[PDB]
Design a protein around this nucleic acid. Sequence first.
DNA 1: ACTCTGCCAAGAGGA
Lengths: 235, 1051
Amino acid sequence: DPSKRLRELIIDFREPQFIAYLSSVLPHDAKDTVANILKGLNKPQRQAMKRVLLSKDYTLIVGMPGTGKTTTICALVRILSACGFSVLLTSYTHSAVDNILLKLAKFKVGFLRLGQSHKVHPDIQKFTEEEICRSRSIASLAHLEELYNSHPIVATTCMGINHPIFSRKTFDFCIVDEASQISQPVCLGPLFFSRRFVLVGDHQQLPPLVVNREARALGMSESLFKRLERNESAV
Amino acid sequence: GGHMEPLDELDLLLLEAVPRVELLRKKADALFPETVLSRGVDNRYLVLAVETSQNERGAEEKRLHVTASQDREHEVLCILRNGWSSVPVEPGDIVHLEGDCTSEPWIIDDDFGYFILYPDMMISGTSVASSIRCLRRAVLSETFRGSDPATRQMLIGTILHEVFQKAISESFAPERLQELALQTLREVRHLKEMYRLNLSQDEILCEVEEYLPSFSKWAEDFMRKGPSSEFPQMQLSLPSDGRSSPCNIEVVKSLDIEESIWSPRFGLKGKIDVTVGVKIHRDCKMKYKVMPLELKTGKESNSIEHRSQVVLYTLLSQERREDPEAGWLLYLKTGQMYPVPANHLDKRELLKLRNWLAASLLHRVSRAAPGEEARLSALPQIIEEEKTCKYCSQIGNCALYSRAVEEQGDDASIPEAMLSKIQEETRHLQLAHLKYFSLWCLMLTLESQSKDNRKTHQSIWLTPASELEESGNCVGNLVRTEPVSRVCDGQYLHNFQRKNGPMPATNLMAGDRIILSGEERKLFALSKGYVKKMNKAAVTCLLDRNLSTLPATTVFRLDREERHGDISTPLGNLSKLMESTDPSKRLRELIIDFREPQFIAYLSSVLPHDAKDTVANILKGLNKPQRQAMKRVLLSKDYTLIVGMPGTGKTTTICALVRILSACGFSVLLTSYTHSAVDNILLKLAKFKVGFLRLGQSHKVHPDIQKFTEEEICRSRSIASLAHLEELYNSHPIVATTCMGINHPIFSRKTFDFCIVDEASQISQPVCLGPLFFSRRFVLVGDHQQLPPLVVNREARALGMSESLFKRLERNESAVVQLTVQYRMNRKIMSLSNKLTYAGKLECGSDRVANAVLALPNLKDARLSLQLYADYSDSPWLAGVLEPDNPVCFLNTDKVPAPEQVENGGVSNVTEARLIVFLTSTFIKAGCSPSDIGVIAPYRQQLRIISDLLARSSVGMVEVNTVDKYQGRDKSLILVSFVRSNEDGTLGELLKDWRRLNVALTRAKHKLILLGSVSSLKRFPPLGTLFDHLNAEQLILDLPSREHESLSHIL
DNA sequence: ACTCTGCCAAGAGGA
Ligand SMILES: Nc1ncnc2c1ncn2[C@@H]1O[C@H](COP(=O)(O)OP(=O)(O)O)[C@@H](O)[C@H]1O
Ligand SMILES: Nc1ncnc2c1ncn2[C@@H]1O[C@H](COP(=O)(O)OP(=O)(O)O)[C@@H](O)[C@H]1O
Ligand code: SF4
Ligand SMILES: [Ca+2]
Ligand SMILES: [Ca+2]
């Protein structure tokens, strides 16, 4: 069923659904915390949070240059976390994902970072599986599990989808930063592990790089963000 | 009976008397005890005779002789015709007639009347409905109740039922429905099932949402306000007119939600989803009927099963209101609503089918002749229909039961394709496995079917609350005026005052399972629940239903839910043990085939390096046997048996093991049978700042452990999302629950490195199995010299049912570690059980423990105060009793006439009672805190006597209890009234038990006083042996005659 | 021949 649903949304362009706003959209006890986050945001930013909360499928956030992509994703992650959702946070590059995490660290939001620690920002390294294992002498299956379950927010790159965690966990949401720069079948990867998803991108900026002329002629630089953009109601 | 050899035998063996009536009255009693036979609406008739014959027309008919008096005054001839002739009724059965006989050759046939076999067995309508396609499936469903597992479709269904039920009170406006869906999806009860099933929260919300427009279409058609011709036209022909002319159906309102009904008229029970007020419009005219509505999610089938359920609901309704004559089936998927008329033919066939189910559920034990060995009875035959069996969720148990228990003696008869299917299903099992499963099913059934687990609800629906108020278990003349507050739906707090002379004179403690009825017969079995507070003015209960629909005018009655002998958990455990998975195979091999548990030799690398120091610090605190127990566990590949002899610090030892395992990074499932045992370990672990999660209902849990429960954390932290619930379940490697709590969703998703079972030697063996399915290795803590699991049935006990799992595994000596250092008893008290029971193995943990004596600061003064009553100056017995340097003392009552009183199968001794009450006063006056004193007696009846006399002497606060209620506990001073004292020599079986005595002799820290008749008691092997040891050190002191000055003021 | 603690429960669909 998860693959069928993705084929229908991505291949057959089935219209993504959204409900009308109601008091009960967010768990009652989260409402105030979310309000305080929203107040900090500008109107388009708030409108992006709203669209995500109302979605049944996906949301496309167009981050035009200088609009504070990392601020906006950080804020969304805070809202989702306050709501008690689990979140899979991804991008193609290490430093993009790490940029969001630096902000989230400042807000004392917990997350686990997967990946080899030498590829990771120095101030994010202490949050990695690798460093926590070394630092805490993890040497038992139950302690390893404990680490994997310790944060609803799990952060990795798009290519990191072979981690054992993805054989065992699914997420309420996946967020993909830089979705308009990522090769469409690479962008698919995290999407198998979440119910709903959010792509952040800008098709007026650089597309995935495709070196072969014939492949480019066939459509290979159409990012997943771009493909989904005909569904205006998600944008 | 007798086997004849000459012709004289044949002549004299000819019988005929009337004593066959008693043979059946006893038989009826064995399964429906204390059933008062009567005439009228709730008639009860005992069957005396049954004969099949040919009718005036050449066809089969059954005739019965019945009576509605315990007296042999009436014999009524009842005749059962057509289909009714095949009712499997036997002489000795309790029956009820729908239509009590007014005429004297009473006929029940295809056209008129119902015959109800065992009216007091209330069978759920859904079981009856499911028995249509297969009787055997229905019986298997009723017995192995957790073999139809929770599905995704079933969760959807549950949620949608709740949304519809919230909506029909409020509104079906789309925005309100969406609201209700959003809120319902976050309820923990639903989140738990999503977790169980590993589903995504929003996926389930989406599925629920797809249905909402159908909810609105339905309400649009049936609940719109408008012209009566605008409601949907149907044909709905009821016995009430003369009809057969289409009419318009309007649903006015819901009158009720989730209405549960017990029917002692039909032997039925059920839950009506929604009770509706309906207007039936026809030719400008209107009729209003109150009708049952059944909600169904999934396929719109209008099936025989579905329709039959509704028909049964219209029967159930007659117990509350007038016959609705029909009900409604609503398929929520499409909003389609189908009328279900309840014809005589349908009710007839359905109640015939209910009789067969009642019969098959009741006749579980076969007996070759009366007094030969018990066997399990065959289930109803495996059926011919391939299609039915293929889709059947009970196939595992069906094949299992076929192969283990009923396996053909001469004739198979089973369909060949089904026959080889049995083979496929059961081929993984060995002979010993089949035998074990079969033996434990029989013993469990015997124990389940025992007379104490058999009492009926008759007393509630027949005798007024007036009669049982002078008994200890019922209260009547109750009322409510206050608003009904709610904790979470399924819990509703109700306040009940007396509005009359305040009647709390009843035996009913808080946390007691109770059944609320109205005193009006038409308001029987309104709600189950427990009692929270028990004031002298009022009584407050948490009940599953909101009873504000009822007028303030109604008068209520409280009645206790008695032990019906539920065995579904242990049966479930046995079934699970027979499954073809590696974890089950490994348990069969260890438990059934006694495969030797393995252990490695110790090495540096046994524990993770970084844990070694932390573990060392824990070990240093322990004594040598304790350390040795930790070591055995760490070296095991299978299990470990820790023998916790009395006073050896069971809870200290388990706490320490849990710390070691936790430091090592293992996950641990911590269990016992009782709440307070598990809670006792947790109190220690809390002090060591070790984290754990506690499962279970928070009101059953120790006050200082409540904050650690799932329930409190959910409330306290507003958990309202699947991910937050998961987070709570994963937050601690240590999970703590009772043995019966194995149905928690966590066990569908998690496994543990280790399971620890406290009190394993007190737990029924198939109950002890339950947690063991969820861990790789296990640890049982117990002592087979202490009390075994209680088994009330003699035959089951004879078959081996009190062998605990701890005991069974003990032949594997290499797994056994004995805790022998004890911190309870002084050298003299310990010495006693060391001689009687523990073969010298117990040691005092210190000089302080060894040399401790009863602290009596005010002895001189208390001693002097006695002189007012009699001359105790130079009294052999009294000085001996009071002397702290005399820790063990036996008071022989032979010279004081101190006989027993026997009433109702229990035993008392007034004289013994007066003696301990005196002794207890003297000790309190001497400076012993009342909380440091425990009174034990073997017989439950004696305790009542002791309790009363202590109340009378202003000294009620000393604990008075049986041996069983002192398990694992101690007191400074223990006084034992060994009640038995008689001339004629009637011995119980109770005092024959070595373990019972052992537990009595080991509850005392400092002083132990024993009282009874040496000449009566010495006839019991444990006491005889006790007397040999007490004598060898002159510890038996003879009381004088009751006339003597030192006793006369007491006696 | 007398000793008693645990489970929420009838149905949530499947055809
Ligand atoms: N809602 C907002 N209100 C005020 N300032 C904002 C908002 N969103 C973004 N900004 C500003 O715009 C910049 C966004 O860039 P970004 O890459 O998100 O963060 P930074 O560059 O601070 O790491 C920030 O420096 C911040 O000052
Ligand atoms: N290894 C040990 N060293 C010293 N004292 C012990 C040891 N094990 C048990 N004890 C003592 O014996 C008693 C054991 O009883 P237990 O039920 O385990 O704990 P408590 O009664 O303190 O709750 C404790 O009071 C404790 O003082
Ligand atoms: S398998 Fe066939 S026979 Fe066995 S119970 Fe299920 S339906 Fe009845
Ligand atoms: Ca229903
Ligand atoms: Ca149902």
